Design a protein around this ligand. Structure first.
Ligand SMILES: [Mn+2]
Ligand SMILES: [Mn+2]
Length: 218
């Protein structure tokens, strides 16, 4: 279910865009403490996700610095790729102006729009725009935000699924680390292990007795 053409036209009007927002690129900045910030970039082409074109950028740093992270990704990405019709940033006035300053710095020009993180406030050209809750343009920006969040969050469902599975396996009395790891590597997640027969789980670890305790905990 895409961004409605009518709402895209209303966005164009709200932002005083010359061109229709045919290509919209959206950025989320998320930080892993003591490791790096991951920027996730989504792409909409006439209101539908263009999943092949989705990208991430990593900024190595122990502590977050979201405005610097945005500045870095704008510069890295748009020194190689063409500008879209519109850039969306998951954040407020600070994150938007960071994107704009970075674009100036590389001699490029593209409209940038944000939605403030807490409220559903639209941010554009150093101003907040407070639309009514049901306003079509707000609903459209929330959709972009929801997809940008979904893609950001997928950066490790795998390692999170495995951690979640382990968390549950830790409640199985007397399984021990080696068999625990065997189950995690074979199944990968709770969804998979919960789909499995007693006989499969028992084959993975070499013990039906323990496999029964696994099923008990699930
Ligand atoms: Mn169309
Ligand atoms: Mn988010």
């Amino acid at each position: 279910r895409g961004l409605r053409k009518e709402a895209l036209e209303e966005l164009m009007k709200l932002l005083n865009m010359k061109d229709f927002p045919y290509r919209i690129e959206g950025i989320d900045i998320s930080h892993l403490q003591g490791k790096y910030t991951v920027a996730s970039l989504v792409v909409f082409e006439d209101g539908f996700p263009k999943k092949g074109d989705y990208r991430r950028y990593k900024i190595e740093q122990d502590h977050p610095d979201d405005y610097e992270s945005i500045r870095t990704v704008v510069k890295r990405r748009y020194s190689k790729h063409p500008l879209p019709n519109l850039l969306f940033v998951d954040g407020g006035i600070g994150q938007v102006n960071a994107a704009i300053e970075a674009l100036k710095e590389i001699g490029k020009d593209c409209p940038v729009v944000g939605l403030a993180k807490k409220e559903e406030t639209v941010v554009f050209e150093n101003r907040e725009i407070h639309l009514p809750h049901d306003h079509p343009v707000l609903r459209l920006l929330v959709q972009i935000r929801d997809e940008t969040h979904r893609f950001a969050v997928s950066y490790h469902r795998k390692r999170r699924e495995k951690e979640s599975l382990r968390s549950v396996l830790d409640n199985v009395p007397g399984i021990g680390p080696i068999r625990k790891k065997k189950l995690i590597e074979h199944f990968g997640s709770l969804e998979n292990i919960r789909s499995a027969s007693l006989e499969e789980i028992a084959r993975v670890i070499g013990s039906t007795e323990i496999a029964r305790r696994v099923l008990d905990i699930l």
